[PDB]
Amino acid sequence: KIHRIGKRKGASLKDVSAWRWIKTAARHFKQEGKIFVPNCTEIMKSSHGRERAPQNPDWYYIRCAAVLRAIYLRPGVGYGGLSKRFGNKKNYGSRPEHTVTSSTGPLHWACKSLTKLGLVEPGAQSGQRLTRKGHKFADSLAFQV
Amino acid sequence: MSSKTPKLFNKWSFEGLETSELALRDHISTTAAYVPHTSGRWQKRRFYKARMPIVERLANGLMFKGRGNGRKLQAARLLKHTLEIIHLLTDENPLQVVVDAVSKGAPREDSTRVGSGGVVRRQAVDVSPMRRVNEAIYQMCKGAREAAFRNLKSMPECLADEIVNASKGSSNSYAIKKKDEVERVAKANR
Amino acid sequence: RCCVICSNQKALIRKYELNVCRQCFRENAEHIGFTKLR
Amino acid sequence: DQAQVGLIIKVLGRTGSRGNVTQVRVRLMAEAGSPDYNRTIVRNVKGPCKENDMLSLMETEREARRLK
Amino acid sequence: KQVQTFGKKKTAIAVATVTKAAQCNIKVNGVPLQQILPDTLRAKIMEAITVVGSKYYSRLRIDVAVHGGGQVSQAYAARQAIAKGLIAFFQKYHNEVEKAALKDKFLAYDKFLLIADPRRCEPKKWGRHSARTRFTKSYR
Amino acid sequence: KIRTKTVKRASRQVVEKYYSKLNFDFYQNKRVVMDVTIAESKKLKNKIAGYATHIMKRLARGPVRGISLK
Amino acid sequence: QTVRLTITSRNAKAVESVTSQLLTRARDEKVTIHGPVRLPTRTLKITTRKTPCGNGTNTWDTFELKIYKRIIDLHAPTEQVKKITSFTMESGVDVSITILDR
RNA sequence: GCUUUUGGUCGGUGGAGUGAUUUGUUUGGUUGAUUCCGUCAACGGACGAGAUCCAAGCUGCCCAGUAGAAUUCAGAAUAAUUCUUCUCUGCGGGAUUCCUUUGUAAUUGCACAAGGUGAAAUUUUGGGCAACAGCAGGUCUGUGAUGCUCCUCAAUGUUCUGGGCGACACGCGCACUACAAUGUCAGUGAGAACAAGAAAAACGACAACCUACUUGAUCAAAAGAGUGGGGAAACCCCGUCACAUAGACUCACUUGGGACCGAGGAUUGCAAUUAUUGGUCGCGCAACGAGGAAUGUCUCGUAGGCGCAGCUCAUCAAACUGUGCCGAUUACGUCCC
What we know:
This is part of a larger assembly, with seven protein chains of seven kinds.
Chain A: H1 16-23, H2 52-66, H3 99-107, H4 122-127
Chain B: H1 54-61, H2 72-90, H3 94-103, E1 109-113, E2 122-127, H4 129-140, H5 142-147, H6 157-167, H7 177-183
Antiparallel strand pairs in B: 1-2
Helix pairs in contact in B: 2-3, 2-6, 3-6
Chain G: E1 4-9, H1 15-22, H2 24-27, E2 33-34, E3 68-74, H3 80-87
Chain A binds one RNA strand of 337 nucleotides through helix 2, helix 3 and helix 4.
PDB class: ribosome
Keywords: ribosome, Leishmania donovani
Entry title: CryoEM structure of the Leishmania donovani 80S ribosome at 2.9 Angstrom resolution
């Protein structure tokens, strides 16, 4: 009786609990160049660190809830003011760029591919521990830590 | 009442509240509410402003000077922090402190031009109930942006610092300093 | 882009919906079926 | 203390050039076994007013508009 | 055993689906009541349930379809669909009295649902800037 | 709120010519209007039906200009 | 061959004056017809400054259209549609329709 | 366009005046209203107002295969059924001063208010329209729309005619707009949600418009290229905001100006010598740190903030036109300016 998002608040959770599971597990893929900015009109360095480390499960929970998408639709989740913009009104646009590489990661490793979403959907199960296992001092009930 | 009738800011006590000053007492909002953000046609009519929780009224009056401002939801965040700092500073229902901080804030009496046609002339004029309500909240939070502008080491505390003080009547609050200094322009003129 | 009713190529002409009526103005040129409402 | 809390009996009218202050007849609010009314002292109020307003007067027993 | 209902604010449309069960909790537009992110909306969207009968009345399985407004007007779209949604039942599946108790307790609460409180942004006009704001004069 | 002489006048022709319109009901005294009168717009009848009931009601007070055949 | 009718015309009492009336040539006769409602209405909105000149009180026109689409659906009569549409003569600017699908 | 946002204007017969002219068109009360009632040497009529209109709001009927919900049956992760709640739209309902308040005012009247019912409560709301007189108001750069009278072939005509300007740097003076300097997003890095009016295309030839998908991707970004349907109900992930995600800053001209700047590079196309840019990345040390007098415009989904298409458009929005999101304090007043 557990669904993707929907039981979870996957805002900073169902991502992050997947993240450690992506990073600590050697299994996945991080391409070489990280020196380049992921995101629309950003002169700030792509982040402090952990650049793909925000990226991947987005694409999964992007895949999962939004079913079919792509390079073009998924950056709708990549957000920016596009504001460096020089003495003009700011305007707004998304990032096609790392998209392909991002979604190649799931093109490997048990998550379906050149059309759909996923194969086994680990997301539930591997996420099924969130209400079980809290990071923040998750309250749950007096029974669960 | 098992959280049915009674209300909570998140969890907070709105029942034991009343205003101290029989002057503006019995018309000021005595709260039953959860979140200060509500939407209705707030003032369609003339005196409708006195109905809704000051909690709104503050949260409503909460952020002038709009630049990229989110107002009510950004305001309510600030009032999460503001009240909490206040009660476990003052050891009271900050619903009281704020209620107690409205009254001591505004001047009971004013001095206006009654002068005719360019002549700047004086009269002692006697402030009205909705003007101690209104001007308090208005200037009360005006102390924020001032105390809050640059030198802050103090993120939300500015709002806490002029609600705490006024509820103490202290003359440091940018709130009350105008209640007196207007009356140095009142009992002097009359 | 010289346009329909006159030599013009000025009084900048609406491309909107590819009707090019500005030459003799879409005010003078009418019966197009437009109306004046709002 | 100085708070002497009266009622508006009525709005005795608009008064003044801008639209702001309004003449009002005030019924001293305090009631005692020797009821001290004025009974009525006319006042000028600053800002909007209404039929049952509580008007605490910090400068009491002044005879208002009279002159101008 | 069902009804259905619609919430509205400005353009925002909430639609209340209705299913029956007495143990159950409600999803947000797409996501459960508890977990909706801006706290300060939650306790509002608690008001439908909490205020008036918290528990004695409705745990009913309920889902809502909310499209046509930005985030907050979609939080006001919602709750109305619930209060509307709930009041629907006790007319169809219950007595006037149980209804009459509830909708009164709303009426005193506010216009939780009396209506969408119809207010729609004004059309921009003429050379007037936005609405009612005029292109500004100079050298006047 | 103030009724043009057109509302005023036509409504005086109805009350002069119809005592079918009796009850102080705006709603009854309205549904007799629109069938009998063509003003081509609703508001006219809505105005007319509103003033037509003022006239009738007031007749019970005393006489009114455009006096009845009574 | 279930056929389809798209009636696109502006003017008052044309879009109505065919589909409402003139399908009762088929509607109440041997044909069996599937009525839906007309699709939504459009407005084609151009706004031009009223002044031929430069000088103005900065005033603008707004000119509009309305285009009225009606969809009306069928089973398959053979050669009757050629007779169906041709029954009724009355309108102007209204649209004739030849459609096949499914 | 303006006088002109207001409520004004005109005549016939009659009356007063030698006459220009005047009465009608008024004291008074009320209304946004020359709007009403009353009074009346005027009586009966014409315009303007109103009302018709247009869109927005609640609603009926029709209706869905180019709208989208309910349910059961089986399947992954603890495809059959019936419908109109949601959407579509033509024509209709609804609103009226309707009860109430011995209310204000008042034997009449015309009405007003606080309150009630209702989606809406007082020209419901935002507009379009709009008299009569005028202005040497603007246009001879809109137009085979036009009077003169200048030009008429090394032309003031024409040139997909060639090149240059219209746009230049004395910080000059001025109007309107965009940026913003904070710890109230505040700067930025990620993450969660959700919107709406609107557009899209080619003939005297054998597709030139958009956009979704996925390759460009063993290595920047924007690019390149191939496939796919749309003639428009092909589309819905816009930022403001939400985030405590335990993120980074951190008594400062600065982890906030994006100006000036020289180097590469992709792009529209006859040609870009700055066309332009999620293009990089250097310059930051250019002002700048709540703005002197003076000045702008509005009152409820309103200002303000935010942003999106459209129009021009081969290429370019700090412009305008329109849509939507966030959403305010102050007066419900006076005539002082």
